[PDB]
């Protein structure tokens, strides 16, 4: 649970309440089926790997810098890297996985288009932050 650390940082990044952004709430259709169940712990590494990847990509944009605290984003990247690297090492090693990865990527595509559409408003950003926050917990717990 140095993943517990990643959520803690995301929490601290919050600037505005979702309750002032109720107009902007959105269902992103997180492809949850692709993780916890059936093909249990360990067969879902590559999917989880892609997730972290996508998150890292998302929060590295100059738009993300404009949205969130520069200091926290740093501690955040450190944390993502740690995981990103460990997961990659496993993927590299031995243990429709493509469909699963595709599903994750489509999910983040939807997230990105949502922000473009909303013109990266603080509210849009808050909605997204809250989602990732949730869908990350689901991925891992």
């Amino acid at each position, epitope marked *: 649970l140095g993943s517990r650390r990643t959520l803690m940082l995301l929490a601290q990044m919050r600037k505005i309440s979702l309750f002032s952004c109720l107009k902007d709430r959105h*269902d992103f259709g997180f492809p949850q089926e692709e993780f916890g169940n059936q093909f249990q712990k360990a067969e879902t590494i590559p999917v989880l790997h892609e997730m972290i990847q996508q998150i890292f990509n998302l929060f590295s944009t100059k738009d993300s810098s404009a949205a969130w605290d520069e200091t926290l984003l740093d501690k955040f990247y450190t944390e993502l890297y740690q995981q990103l690297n460990d997961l990659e090492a496993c993927v590299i090693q031995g243990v429709m996985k493509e469909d699963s990865i595709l599903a994750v990527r489509k999910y983040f595509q939807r997230i990105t288009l949502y922000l473009k559409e909303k013109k990266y408003s603080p509210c849009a950003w808050e909605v997204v932050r809250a989602e990732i926050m949730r869908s990350f917990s689901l991925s891992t717990n």
Partner: antibody
Amino acid sequence: EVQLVESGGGLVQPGGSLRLSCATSGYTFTEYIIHWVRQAPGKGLEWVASINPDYDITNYNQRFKGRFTISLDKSKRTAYLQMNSLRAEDTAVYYCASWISDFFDYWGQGTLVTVSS
Amino acid sequence: DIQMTQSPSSLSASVGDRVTITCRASQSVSTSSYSYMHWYQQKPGKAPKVLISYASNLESGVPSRFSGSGSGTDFTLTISSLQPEDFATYYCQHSWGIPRTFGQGTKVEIKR
């Protein structure tokens, strides 16, 4: 003024099949996710499936994965629930419901499905 | 997947009384910042009606006697001044992923 109208309910024998439809009106179609939620008489509420018209995502309660199919016709502003191999425990009022996210904003009046010989 | 247990199942109280219904999720339905648990009201022969969203956000048009608190796994609907028109069954549901599940419901009847 948002309005959800489910129809196609009635009587079927066990093992038979049915197709519920829900006709929507009064809002931009692609903005709401449409759900089916049922309720056995006297009993509690059970989520069946949802469909997202904006994208094309669907989700199912694992209980009904094999038998039930949700689908839609965007031109007709209508969502459908195809039920198969109906057991007697599928007797319930089937609500059509909508949401933008997390919680339900709108509902139909419900349509009663009775599975009996 | 996430199951929830309301208590009491059934309940009786006089008009004006304070009423408390609780809902217990089989696992956390919270982020450190938001709880994804909602409360509905179903009057007999009618579709449910959302009251509280995200554990404590009172929905538009709902009377102020209604309120929700809680986080993690333990949540509470409170009617502070029970009224005759508040006779109904009350359900909790979560939107912490899939499947979406409701509680078994809590029947509230008015003592007169």
